[PDB]
Amino acid sequence: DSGPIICAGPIHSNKSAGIPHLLGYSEKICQIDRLIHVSSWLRNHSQFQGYVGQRGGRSQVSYYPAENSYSRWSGLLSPCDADWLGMLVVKKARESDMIVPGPSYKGKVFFERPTFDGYVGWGCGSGKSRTESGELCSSDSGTSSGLLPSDRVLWIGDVACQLMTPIPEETFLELKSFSQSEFPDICKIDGIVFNQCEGESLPQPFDVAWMDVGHSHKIIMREHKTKWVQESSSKDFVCYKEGTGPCSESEEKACKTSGSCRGDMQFCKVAGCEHGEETSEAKCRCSLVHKPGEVVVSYGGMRVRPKCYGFSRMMATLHHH
Amino acid sequence: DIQMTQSPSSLSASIGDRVTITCRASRHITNHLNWYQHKPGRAPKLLIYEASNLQAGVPSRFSGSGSGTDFTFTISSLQPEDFATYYCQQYDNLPPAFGGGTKVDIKR
Amino acid sequence: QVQLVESGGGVVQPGRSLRLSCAASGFTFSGFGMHWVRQAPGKGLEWVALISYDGSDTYYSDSVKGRFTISRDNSKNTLYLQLKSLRPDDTAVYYCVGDRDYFGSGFFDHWGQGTLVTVSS
Ligand SMILES: *[C@@H]1O[C@H](CO)[C@@H](O[C@@H]2O[C@H](CO)[C@@H](O[C@@H]3O[C@H](CO)[C@@H](O)[C@H](O)[C@@H]3O)[C@H](O)[C@H]2NC(C)=O)[C@H](O)[C@H]1NC(C)=O
Ligand SMILES: *[C@@H]1O[C@H](CO)[C@@H](O[C@@H]2O[C@H](CO)[C@@H](O)[C@H](O)[C@H]2NC(C)=O)[C@H](O)[C@H]1NC(C)=O
């Protein structure tokens, strides 16, 4: 089932322990592997004591739809994973943010949903968890230890985030109009005006493919195609010590910019390696992360490298004929 | 699966001395190790978790260190109550394992 | 505040079945994994079994696997260990143990006083 990128699932020994601010793209990935980022989100926003993801890690998180394709690739980054790396922000839920029906919000402490204008998260505090509907957090004595399993987390939709190639606004307007033409029925998506209607049905579930292009709102699609290109970058690689764990920034920088470390074939054909010296010792090894590559989508005659792309459930209001 | 080995089996030391028990794990368990004090009649008591952390309310003379396979449990200044048997326990693999132990006697 | 009151020990003969119970007070029992640790006469400690907060995850040592069954009623705040096919090796003092996380990961924080089980004919 998926598997960790670098670091196995955590076994946390104290719920009051702190969440350190590590600086390397490997230490960050390791914290992602162990759901340290989602636990931090809980501590800040929902005033929550402890860690979520004990012994499970990111790989044991629950998805909706549960048959989640991207999950099978450990390298593909969920909206929370991009949050921990700075690529985007998952906002704290407000009253207006509509909780979509269909997922199994029961016992969940955290769940995350891509919205039409961004990414939103709902949390529960200490000793509480979500009721069947997801509208309320209520006392849950099975959440009392503060060292909670990974299935308490719910990531909605088959989403995968990456480094975009920025697009000019003229391209965004082209792509925004084409989506409007393709979904003329829709009035609002997640409260954001999409078409001009003057008569709107009540909010309704909406399953749609979308893409984050780095502008105000996502662009939803019906007819699109995808292609998983392999484009080498530094973030294609994580560097690790086989027993110490993730390496430090200065070490990993020395690996990726100085050809001083070791690693698998693709890394050596990017940065540089060496062998025939290691007697017993220990030196950082760098390996390729497990993903098909960077995703490129074709839509409206144009071809874009998005920040995030996936098929999730948003809330849309339709026309009243 | 994982078979912990402690050394020495026994150790005699007088009050005020430094007592250094060592524990060894057949495989790498990172820092997933605990140390326990057991005295005759009374139940075991948990001193160190994560191989270096002090349990709440335990004197600062007790310590712990190590990571990987070789670990260490040290009493900086022995006290008369500190005479008991001590155990190390791994929790990296789901079957938890106690080492053999180490009895602490008093030099006379 | 956090106590564990064991009960059920006694004199049973080889091939008989005893039942042990561990009443937990002072903490939210349903949110913590529990253990059972035993110590035979003249020997060291030996972990026996563990149960998760839900009861959904159980784990046992090799020496007892298939004979001893660990269970918990989280509406009465008592932990159980069901002994079967008992043997002289099982002659020991049986301690129940409270852990720190949802599962019984192996942090033997708060113990009970213990109960003696003796197997001979
Ligand atoms: C929840 O709040 C914690 C803080 O209590 C957040 O962690 C903090 O994140 C900021 C932003 O990345 C860190 O600031 C950074 O400082 C370094 C130098 O130390 C600087 O180079 C960076 O540019 C940035 O300014 C801060 O250090 C860090 N603190 C800790 C203790 O982790 C955390 O990100 C919040 N949760 C989520 C999900 O974002
Ligand atoms: C869990 O972690 C907390 C924080 O590290 C521990 O509490 C601190 O422990 C030290 C040493 O006992 C004290 O000096 C501090 O005053 C404590 N801080 C607070 C805010 O309580 C706590 O003891 C740990 N718990 C366990 C089970 O070991």
TrEMBL record, chain A:
<feature type="disulfide bond">
    <location>
        <begin position="124"/>
        <end position="137"/>
    </location>
</feature>
<feature type="disulfide bond">
    <location>
        <begin position="161"/>
        <end position="308"/>
    </location>
</feature>
<protein>
    <recommendedName>
        <fullName>Envelopment polyprotein</fullName>
    </recommendedName>
</protein>
<feature type="disulfide bond">
    <location>
        <begin position="247"/>
        <end position="284"/>
    </location>
</feature>
<feature type="disulfide bond">
    <location>
        <begin position="187"/>
        <end position="197"/>
    </location>
</feature>
<feature type="disulfide bond">
    <location>
        <begin position="255"/>
        <end position="261"/>
    </location>
</feature>
<feature type="disulfide bond">
    <location>
        <begin position="268"/>
        <end position="273"/>
    </location>
</feature>
<feature type="disulfide bond">
    <location>
        <begin position="239"/>
        <end position="286"/>
    </location>
</feature>
<feature type="disulfide bond">
    <location>
        <begin position="7"/>
        <end position="30"/>
    </location>
</feature>
<comment type="similarity">
    <text>Belongs to the phlebovirus envelope glycoprotein family.</text>
</comment>
